[PDB]
Amino acid sequence: VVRKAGWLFFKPLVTLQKERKLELVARRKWKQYWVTLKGCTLLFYETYGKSAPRCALFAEDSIVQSVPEHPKKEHVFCLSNSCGDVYLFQATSQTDLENWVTAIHSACASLFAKKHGKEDTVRLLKSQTRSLLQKIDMDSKMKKMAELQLSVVSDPKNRKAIENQIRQWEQNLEKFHMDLFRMRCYLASLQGGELPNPKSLLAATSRPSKLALGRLGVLSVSSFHALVCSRD
Numbered sequence: 019v020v021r022k023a024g025w026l027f028f029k030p031l032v033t034l035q036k037e038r039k040l041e042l043v044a045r046r047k048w049k050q051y052w053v054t055l056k057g058c059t060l061l062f063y064e065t066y067g068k069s070a071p072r073c074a075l076f077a078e079d080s081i082v083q084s085v086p087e088h089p090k091k092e093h094v095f096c097l098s099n100s101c102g103d104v105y106l107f108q109a110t111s112q113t114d115l116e117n118w119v120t121a122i123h124s125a126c127a128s129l130f131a132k133k134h135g136k137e138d139t140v141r142l143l144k145s146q147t148r149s150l151l152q153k154i155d156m157d158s159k160m161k162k163m164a165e166l167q168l169s170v171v172s173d174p175k176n177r178k179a180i181e182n183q184i185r186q187w188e189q190n191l192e193k194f195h196m197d198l199f200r201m202r203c204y205l206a207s208l209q210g211g212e213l214p215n216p217k218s219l220l221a222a223t224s225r226p227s228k229l230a231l232g233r234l235g236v237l238s239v240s241s242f243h244a245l246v247c248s249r250d
Contacts, residue, residue: 034102
């Protein structure tokens with residue numbers, strides 16, 4: 019069944035190319051489509067209806083963020099999927115944007131709960147946030163321990179070996195923070211609350227990550243999400 023439907027301007031922004039590196043989509047432009055949300059799939063139709071979609075967007079495990087700062091358009095929101103892709107959408111109003119964000123996050127939370135074989139979605143989400151928080155605490159401590167051990171190592175290759183480990187700990191932490199943010203987005207959308215502060219998530223981006231996002235040309239929660247996905 020359809021959870022929501024309505025006109026939307028669409029524009030692909032980022033994609034994961036071979037070698038698994040992110041890149042801005044070339045020749046990207048705004049096109050309007052009558053869009054429908056069925057399950058966690060966004061179907062795009064070139065004409066209003068109530069007849070085959072021109073394309074589909076499988077949004078399982080996605081994150082949606084409003085983009086009020088967009089310089090030329092209002093009511094823009096951004097969807098980053100679980101594959102390293104980032105998309106832009108323009109709703110018809112602020113209310114319409116909120117309805118879309120709520121709809122997509124609710125569908126995703128639903129599928130998420132379904133995959134974990136649970137019917138109490140809110141409880142699963144809360145349980146997840148607690149778990150992610152403990153993992154962050156645990157891995158943060160492991161990372162400091164590794165760094166302390168590296169401090170006395172002079173051996174060249176032995177040095178890099180521990181650094182490689184430190185980087186993994188660092189990447190695992192970004193992923194946990196990303197999952198934590200995503201879980202809070204789902205919870206907020208299901209309970210009518212304010213979505214989690216994106217600035218708080220960007221504070222967890224490592225220097226290497228920030229540089230990569232900087233070379234990409236887009237530094238935000240959405241591109242950060244795409245970066246974390248590219249490592250999967």
